[PDB]
Amino acid sequence: TSGSIINHANNLNKVINHVFADKPLISETMLKILTIDGTTGKDGYRNWLD
Amino acid sequence: HALIKEDLGQWPVETGISLVNQAGVFAVQLANKLGIDKPFVLDAGSNYFT
Numbered sequence: 840t841s842g843s844i845i846n847h848a849n850n851l852n853k854v855i856n857h858v859f860a861d862k863p864l865i866s867e868t869m870l871k872i873l874t875i876d877g878t879t880g881k882d883g884y885r886n887w888l889d
Numbered sequence: 890h891a892l893i894k895e896d897l898g899q900w901p902v903e904t905g906i907s908l909v910n911q912a913g914v915f916a917v918q919l920a921n922k923l924g925i926d927k928p929f930v931l932d933a934g935s936n937y938f939t
Contacts, residue, residue, distance in 0.1 A: 840939060841937070841938075841939045
């Protein structure tokens with residue numbers, strides 16, 4: 840509803856980490872994909888969301 | 890009663906001298922007031938709320 844695409848994806852990982860704190864593998868795995876995807880820029884973040 | 894006003898400053902103007910020449914110095918000072926003189930691009934997308 841509001842906010843940039845980058846702020847959307849950056850904040851989702853923080854919530855993912857908090858919700859899934861018992862299993863730390865999800866946050867580490869999900870950020871690994873984002874690091875490769877996020878180099879392209881805002882277009883890369885859209886690929887991660889898709 | 891109520892009214893809305895655009896201040897835009899107040900400037901002295903003389904007579905016997907061509908007005909276009911006097912408008913030049915005030916035009917430069919007006920650009921300084923509006924932050925227009927130097928090259929710029931507007932960044933107002935982030936200023937909002939829902």
